[PDB]
Amino acid sequence: GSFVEMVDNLRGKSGQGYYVEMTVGSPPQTLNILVDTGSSNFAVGAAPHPFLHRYYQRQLSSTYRDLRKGVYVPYTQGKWEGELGTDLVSIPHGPNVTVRANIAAITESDKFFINGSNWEGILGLAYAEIARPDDSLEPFFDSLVKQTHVPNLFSLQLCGASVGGSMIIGGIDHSLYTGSLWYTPIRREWYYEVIIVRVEINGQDLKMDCKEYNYDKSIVDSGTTNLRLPKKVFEAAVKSIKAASSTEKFPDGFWLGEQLVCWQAGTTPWNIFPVISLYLMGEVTNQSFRITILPQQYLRPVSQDDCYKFAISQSSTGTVMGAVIMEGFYVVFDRARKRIGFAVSACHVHDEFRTAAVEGPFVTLDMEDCGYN
Ligand SMILES: O=C([C@@H]1CNC[C@]12CCCc1ccccc12)N1CC[C@@H](c2ccccc2)C[C@H]1c1ccccc1
Numbered sequence: 373g374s375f376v377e378m379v380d381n382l383r384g385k386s387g388q389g390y391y392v393e394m395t396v397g398s399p400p401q402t403l404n405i406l407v408d409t410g411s412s413n414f415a416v417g418a419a420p421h422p423f424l425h426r427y428y429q430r431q432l433s434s435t436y437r438d439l440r441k442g443v444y445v446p447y448t449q450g451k452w453e454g455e456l457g458t459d460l461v462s463i464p465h466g467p468n469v470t471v472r473a474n475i476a477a478i479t480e481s482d483k484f485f486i487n488g489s490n491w492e493g494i495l496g497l498a499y500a501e502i503a504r505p506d507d508s509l510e511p512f513f514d515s516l517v518k519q520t521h522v523p524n525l526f527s528l529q530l531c532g533a534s535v536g537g538s539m540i541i542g543g544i545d546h547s548l549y550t551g552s553l554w555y556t557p558i559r560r561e562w563y564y565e566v567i568i569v570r571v572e573i574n575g576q577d578l579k580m581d582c583k584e585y586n587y588d589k590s591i592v593d594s595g596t597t598n599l600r601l602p603k604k605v606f607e608a609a610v611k612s613i614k615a616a617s618s619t620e621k622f623p624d625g626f627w628l629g630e631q632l633v634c635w636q637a638g639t640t641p642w643n644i645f646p647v648i649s650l651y652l653m654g655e656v657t658n659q660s661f662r663i664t665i666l667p668q669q670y671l672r673p674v675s676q677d678d679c680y681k682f683a684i685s686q687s688s689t690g691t692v693m694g695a696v697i698m699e700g701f702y703v704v705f706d707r708a709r710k711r712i713g714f715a716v717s718a719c720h721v722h723d724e725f726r727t728a729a730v731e732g733p734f735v736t737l738d739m740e741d742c743g744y745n
Contacts, residue, residue, distance in 0.1 A: 375545040381465035382407065382530070382537035383490070387597050387672055387681075390530055390537055390695070391491040395462045396475065397433030402464070406494040407528070407539055409564050409705065410593030410692070412503040413445060414461070414512040415454060416493030418477035423485040424492050430477055435460045443476045445504050450483030461512070466541045469520040473512045494595070497526070497705070501562035513707075516541075524708040528594055531719035532699040533673055549702035549715035554661040554730050556652035558710045559743060563591040566712060568691060569660050569739045570651035571605070573612040580608055582742035589690035589744060592703065592712055596694030599648075599670060600687035609648075609684065616646035626682055634679040642667050642723055650697070653739050654732065655711065660739065661732030663714050665700050668721050669728065672696070690744075700728035 383404070384390040391404040396416065403416055403426060417427040430436045439456035454476045461473040478484075478493070485492075500507040500514060510518075517524045522542040529538040529548045538548055559565040568585040571578040587602050601609055610627045620641065625631035635641075645667035651660045672683040683696045700720055704713030714730045722728060 373545050373547050375540050375543055378466055378540050379538045379545060379548070380536055382539055384535040384537075385489060386533045386535055387674070388486050388489040389491060389595060390535065392466065392495070392539055393464055394493075394495065395464055396428060397459045398435040399432070401428060401433065403428065403492045404490050406491045406595060407497065408494050408593075408595030409497045409528070410591060410595045411494065411496035412498040412500060412511045413443070413476055413494065413496040413509070414473055415445070415452065415476035415478050415496075417485065418454065419479045421481065421485055423487045423489070425490070426492055428477060428493075430457065433459055439474075441505070443504055447483075450481070452478050452481035452484045454478040454480075456509070463541065466539065467516070467520070467522045469516065469522060471515050471519045473515045474509055497594075498563055499561040525704065525706050527702060527704040528698065529702045529717055529719060530594065530695055530698045531717070532669070532695070532721055537719070544704060548718050550718060551716050551730065553702075553704060553713040553715040554732055555655050555706070555711040555713045556661075557655065558712060561710070563589065564593070564705065564712060565589050565591055566693070567653040567739065567742050568650055569653055569736045569742050570662075571609065572649040572651075572662075573609065574616050574646035575649070576612065578605075578608055578612060580605060583744065585691060586742055587690065587744050590693065591690065592693045592698070594695065594698060596692045597672070597696065598683045598685045598692070598694050599696045600685050600692035600694065602690060603686055603688065605691070606684070606686045613646055617644050619644045629682055629685055632674055632679045632681055634677040637676050637678060640671075640678055640680070643725060645671065647726060650693075651734065651736060652714070653742070656733075658735055658737050658739070659732070660734045660736040661714075661730065662734065663697070663701060664729040664731070665697060666722060666726055666728055668723070669700050670696050701730065
């Protein structure tokens with residue numbers, strides 16, 4: 373394929389995020405940068421920090437322009453602060469272009485950088501609406517599309533377990549997937565917001581009002597590890613997953629992520645755990661499709677023992693389809709056509725009895741009733 377040089381341009385550690393090399397300034401300064409479809413700022417470590425091997429040195433970059441305004445990104449659960457500027461940015465294993473992008477130079481942070489993650493910054497790939505300090509700060513990808521002829525599309529193949537993957541910028545690599553691509557509309561351009569219309573555990577409908585699946589939003593977020601579900605959905609899903617996997621018993625805290633369970637090397641009974649199906653709104657009236665994930669996806673590896681964390685968790689800010697979901701699939705962020713495509717990944721981690729799937733079409737009525745207003 374023509375996109376060959378962008379294949380396998382992602383690295384990472386399990387549960388710690390996928391990152392791509394980005395080259396900033398003049399002369400060149402290359403950093404490892406977290407690929408995050410759940411935020412909208414391009415920001416880099418710019419001062420020494422215990423968890424950073426390298427950082428951005430603005431004084432050494434002749435093309436760096438100070439924007440003379442501070443920037444702060446808040447969280448649950450930590451934060452970072454820095455200075456706004458612009459500089460020249462290229463992706464050596466991405467598109468053959470160089471753009472002047474907004475860059476936040478991180479000078480202080482709390483619980484942002486992860487010990488041993490090997491990334492030194494973050495690439496916010498979502499829309500300007502959620503950018504800090506506000507929506508006037510053009511996100512990187514917006515700059516890329518405005519300044520170059522790179523098509524308004526990227527795609528992600530995240531390969532789970534030391535992890536790897538591909539970010540194809542400007543197109544779709546057909547070697548990265550099998551079968552067909554199925555598209556769900558981007559409801560609104562802020563986060564990558566989608567609509568979930570039905571949930572099944574081992575083919576059994578969870579039978580909740582579909583509004584609950586998308587309260588108060590459902591997003592596709594490459595920077596979040598887990599499948600995160602609204603409290604009511606989480607509880608019903610856990611109750612159903614428990615009942616489906618009853619050939620073995622697990623402590624209550626396992627389902628809450630407070631306890632881990634370990635198996636002797638290569639003896640994890642994947643077969644005892646159910647498959648989970650998320651149905652997404654399709655592109656045609658009353659039409660949906662489903663993506664199916666294996667226990668290999670939602671049980672994350674954390675001696676001769678393999679330890680696993682239950683990687684479905686509770687959320688009070690909507691559903692978050694994180695890496696747990698994305699790792700089964702080749703995921704197309706077709707910004708040009710306001711839609712997200714899903715196909716079975718060529719690097720899909722499966723066993724000999726079951727496989728991750730993207731299947732359709734299905735008939736689902738009143739799907740418009742499922743969205744939060
Ligand atoms: O939710 C996120 C991202 C979205 N995907 C992964 C995320 C979610 C899970 C946590 C996390 C951790 C590291 C990197 C990414 C992410 N944010 C970016 C960084 C985050 C932050 C975290 C810790 C300290 C300071 C800032 C603030 C937030 C944010 C997003 C959008 C607007 C404002 C803030």
